[PDB]
Amino acid sequence: PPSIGIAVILVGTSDEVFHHLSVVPRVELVAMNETDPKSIITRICDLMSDRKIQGVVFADDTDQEAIAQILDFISAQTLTPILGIHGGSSMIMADKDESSMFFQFGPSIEQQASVMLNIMEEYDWYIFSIVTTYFPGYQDFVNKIRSTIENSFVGWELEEVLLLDMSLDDGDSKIQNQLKKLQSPIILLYCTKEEATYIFEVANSVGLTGYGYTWIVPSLVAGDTDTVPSEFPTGLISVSYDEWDYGLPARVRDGIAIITTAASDMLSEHSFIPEPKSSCYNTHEKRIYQSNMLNRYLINVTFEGRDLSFSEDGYQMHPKLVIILLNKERKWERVGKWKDKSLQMKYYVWPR
Amino acid sequence: DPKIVNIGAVLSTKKHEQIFREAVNQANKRHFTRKIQLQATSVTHRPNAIQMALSVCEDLISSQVYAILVSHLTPTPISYTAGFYRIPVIGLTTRMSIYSDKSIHLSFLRTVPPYSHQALVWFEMMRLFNWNHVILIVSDDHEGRAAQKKLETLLEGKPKADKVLQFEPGTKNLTALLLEAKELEARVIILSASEDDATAVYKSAAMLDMTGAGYVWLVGEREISGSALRYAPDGIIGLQLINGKNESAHISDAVAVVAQAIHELFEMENITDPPRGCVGNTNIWKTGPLFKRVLMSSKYPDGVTGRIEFNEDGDRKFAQYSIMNLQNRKLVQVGIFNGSYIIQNDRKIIWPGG
Ligand SMILES: *[C@@H]1O[C@H](CO)[C@@H](O)[C@H](O)[C@H]1NC(C)=O
Ligand SMILES: *[C@@H]1O[C@H](CO)[C@@H](O)[C@H](O)[C@H]1NC(C)=O
Ligand SMILES: *[C@@H]1O[C@H](CO)[C@@H](O)[C@H](O)[C@H]1NC(C)=O
Ligand SMILES: *[C@@H]1O[C@H](CO)[C@@H](O)[C@H](O)[C@H]1NC(C)=O
User: Fold this and answer.
1) Strand A56-60 to strand A82-86: parallel, antiparallel, or no bridges (unpaired)?
2) Cα–Cα distance between A18 and A301 in angstroms, integer?
3) How far off is chain A from B82, nearest CA to CA, in Å?
């Protein structure tokens, strides 16, 4: 019977935790302290040239959205499948490298935006405004909402698309000047969690974070549902990945599954599996075609339970989406659930 | 004794590393280096994108560079790595329009203009010869669609004037597109592809009499890159960018501007140094955003490559291209584009088919 190595870089998690297919996995767990480039790059590069790994489940307990980016880099460059289960390693990275084998647990920005519009579809929150920064996905996000609108009989009214540049000094309060334009009950904000907090301190400043205005945000903004910033407004409705029923160890199992089912299907039909990564520095197109193939399996996977398929794009097809709310006590409370179709909300009359 | 600030650089040859070591120095003479004083740390390209990106960390971030000049991979390591920290990267010869996206390379500056800006000339050209209906053939990749935008943006001034046929990069037989283009029945044709891909268009269009009289073939620089002329229709028009390949001339002017602007930075209170390691640091260099603001707002006359201004995206604001007509087997230059207006050479245009 044939082994496949599966490294499990787990960044800060004091936890721990069922298969009858053709390849048996040789899992080997590992933790790391740092989430910087050289730190992340060099861990995965060694667990190969030493331990003959073949794919990576990777989770962290941080909001470092750039972890996702460093992992896409490492994957494309070594043609090794990397899975990002939790944390910044799973905040949707909008466009990935062509050659990449990196998939993340969580919805497409387009999924979320479609959720967010289903949420105003309920309470008829039809007059709104999109805000973005230049984080990867602003265009996809804004266009996705703009698209749903244009061809609806329903009276959506989109008052302003604000695009904020955060790569400058901020020394001129142009951002402050820019949000002056904003005056709408629903304002949608696409930006990182670190980017979010500054947009609020200026919104609180301009009296837009006052009551009478409602700010919806995607998962990444919420991020760690435990950490609720001062600068965050009370009531920042958000989508988030429903860890409530979906445990961390519950993920890592599914990580192991996908990769191993993928290998297992591939052996069944093609009667061979990628030879374990030779070296981080050993890069060929001798592995271009095997890699392209295994990606086709990685993306179409069924386990004991549900459909764990991904898209070619990196996001997850049918994720575990939960809507949440920042209450008076600075806590995140499940207000709504996105069944695989329609959404069940908690409150008919929105909490006045 | 003064503050020693570093400038990094990833350079194509060990010789260029010296032209950069010296450039930093002529700046450390022209200044007046008593509070701050620059210091030049540099590497050669490592061919592997990971080896490269580790080097940015170990060889350059470790030295707390305030910026890095750049010359199996393109600068994506130096940008993903230092760009994490927001240390401004300055590309000296990179023409690819990918790097003009703030979303993906937010601390990025380049001394050459992206290929997409050839559209500017393509536009002013159409104004000169009153081309009102053109067919745009573009690789369906970021570089091709990059070009399609800039040209179309330019046509807004008053997108019906261009009909667009895209194609999957790497396609071999292109008659299907082309015969669709022949049904679309246009005389003018703008191309955006690589050498190898334009080659394929160049061939398939030869099989259909689209290389001949009546047609105009307008084009960029990769599209008449080397190996691509063997098959390009006589009477094409291409572009080569003036002094866009001189890694040495660009090391000169960049250091001048970084120098001018590293000095510019220290007029401010509340200044902080970029991280030493890569290891352990996972927060942006705090000032690196302001530093980027400075470089951008820096203008430089009497630069060896010309006046070095910077647009909203941190590309070179103005640029000159030697226009090029192919005739028989010689690539005569029928005019230059002075960054603003076209100026024809004494040699006249020999269209496709005399
Ligand atoms: C697998 O892919 C097919 C298309 O080949 C798709 O229609 C199907 O829904 C996918 N099934 C699962 C279980 O993901
Ligand atoms: C391209 O394809 C067409 C039909 O699909 C064929 O007639 C033609 O010969 C092909 N050209 C080459 C060079 O193979
Ligand atoms: C390129 O730069 C070198 C300096 O190394 C200079 O001597 C030469 O004239 C330049 N070439 C062109 C064509 O400008
Ligand atoms: C710089 O920091 C000082 C405190 O050290 C503060 O008083 C000042 O306002 C800061 N400058 C700016 C422009 O905020």
Assistant:
1) parallel
2) 16
3) 10
Closest CA to B255 of B25, B13, B37: B25
Burial grade of B213 (CB within 10 A; 0-12, 13-18, 19 or more):
exposed
The topology (CATH level 3) of B1-113+248-319 is Rossmann fold (3.40.50)
Q: Is A198 in CB contact (< 8 Å) with chain B?
A: no
The candidate with the shortest Cα–Cα distance to A189, out of A116, A115, A124, is: A116
**A90 and A219 Cβ atoms separated by less than 8 Å:** no
For residue A302, give the ligand 1 atom closest to its CA: 13
- What residues pair up with B69 in beta bridges, in sequence order? B9, B90
Q: Using an 8 Å Cβ cutoff, are A83 and A58 in contact?
A: yes
The secondary structure of residue B61, as a DSSP letter, is G
| Residues of chain B with C-beta less than 8 angstroms from the C-beta of A64 | 282
- Which residue is closest in CA terms to ligand 4's atom 3? B270
**Strand partners of residue B135:** B163, B189
Whole-angstrom Cα distance, residue B270 to residue B284? 16
Residues of chain B with CATH 3.40.50.2300: 1-113+248-319, 114-247+320-354
Nearest Cβ partner of B106 from A37, A167, A283? A167
Q: Whose CA is nearest to atom 2 of ligand 3?
A: B249
Q: Indicate which of A11, A35, A38, A172 best probes the interface with B, i.e. most B CBs within 10 Å of its own CB.
A: A38
Give the gyration radius of chain A's Cα atoms. Answer: 21
Q: Which residue of A has its CA nearest to B73?
A: A77
The domain segmentation of chain A, as residue ranges, is: 1-106+241-319, 107-240+320-352
Q: How far apart are CA A25 and CA B337, in angstroms?
A: 62
- Contact across the interface for A78 and B50, Cβ inside 8 Å: yes
Q: Does the Cβ of B287 fall within 6 Å of ligand 4?
A: no
Count of Cβ atoms closer than 10 Å to residue A47 Cβ: 20
Q: Which CATH superfamily is domain A107-240+320-352 in?
A: Response regulator (3.40.50.2300)
Which helix (H) or strand (E) segment holds residue B343: the answer is strand B342-344
Question: Which ligand is in closest contact with the Cα of A173?
Answer: 4
How buried is A62 (Cβ within 10 angstroms: 0-12 exposed, 13-18 middle, 19+ buried)? buried
**Residue in B72, B80, B103 nearest the CB of A136:** B103
Q: How far apart are CA A27 and CA A53, in angstroms?
A: 9
Residues of A in Cβ contact (< 8 Å) with B84: 36-37, 66, 69-70
Partner B contacted by A163 (CB < 8 A) = no
Structural tokens at position B30: 């022209």
A1-106+241-319 with A107-240+320-352: one CATH topology?
yes
Cα distance between residue A142 and residue A94, in whole Å = 13
Cβ-defined contact of A38 to B58 (cutoff 8 Å): yes
Q: Which CATH number applies to A1-106+241-319: 3.40.50.2300, 3.30.2380.10, 3.40.109.10, 3.55.40.20?
A: 3.40.50.2300
Question: Nearest CA of chain A to the CA of B47: how many Å?
Answer: 10
Q: Where would I find the beta strands (DSSP E) of B71-167?
A: 89-91, 108-110, 134-139, 162-167
Provide the residue count of chain B. Answer: 354
Chain A neighbors of B104, CB-CB under 8 A: 95, 136
Tell me if B57 sits within 8 A of B78, measured CB to CB: no
CATH of domain B114-247+320-354: 3.40.50.2300
